[PDB]
């Protein structure tokens, strides 16, 4: 997903990161309440957040 | 009968704690020795 994320701009990356964080919070609530059956989604969203932050760091020249 | 060990945490830390050990060269050699021995607990510091 790094290739498709690398095409987006910094503002789009920030919007995507915020969306991923909201999704992570919702998944956390569902898992805690026991309404989540697809536990693999938690790791998926965590690693996606890491990808976005890495790309933001790359674009910032860091 | 009153026995020899009368615990006080403040006194324990002032007497033997990490910062007391770091305050002198001889105390830093205690720490160096315990690290070389591989102690899991370097000092009384809780």
């Amino acid at each position: 997903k790094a290739k498709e994320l690398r095409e987006k701009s910094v503002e789009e990356l920030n919007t995507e990161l915020l969306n991923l964080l909201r999704e992570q919070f919702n998944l956390r609530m569902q898992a805690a309440s026991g309404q989540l059956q697809q536990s693999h989604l938690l790791k998926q969203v965590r690693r996606d957040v890491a990808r976005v932050k890495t790309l933001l760091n790359e674009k910032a020249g860091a | 009968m009153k026995r020899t060990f009368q615990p006080s945490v403040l006194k324990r830390n002032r007497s033997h704690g990490f910062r007391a050990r770091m305050a002198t060269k001889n105390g830093r050699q205690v720490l160096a020795r315990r690290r070389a021995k591989g102690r899991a607990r370097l000092t009384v510091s809780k």
Partner: protein, 93 residues
């Protein structure tokens, strides 16, 4: 202003128990597991923004984790923070 990214990390889970249920049905107070370093102000802002309810006051406490045995191995569960979040009258969660 507390940043939304921080607000999204401070609420960890609802806390389910007889005391929590009684708190909800008697004093309009919901009980949450919250991040260990969360403050009362952070919890209040997060509840208001994410659950969309008005909050009266937040009370907090730190639960010390228990020492447990597992196959002769001795371990310790982590400390965590509990929040009793009183909602304004009329709000429902």
């Amino acid at each position: 202003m507390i940043r939304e990214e921080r607000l999204l990390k401070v609420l960890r889970a609802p806390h389910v128990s007889e005391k929590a249920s009684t708190a909800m049905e008697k004093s309009n107070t919901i009980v949450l597991k919250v991040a260990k370093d969360a403050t009362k102000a952070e919890i209040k802002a997060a509840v208001q923004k994410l659950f969309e309810v008005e909050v009266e006051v937040v009370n907090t406490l730190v639960v010390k984790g228990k020492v447990k045995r597992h196959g002769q191995r001795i371990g310790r569960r982590s400390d965590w923070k509990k929040a009793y979040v009183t909602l304004k009258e009329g709000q429902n969660l």
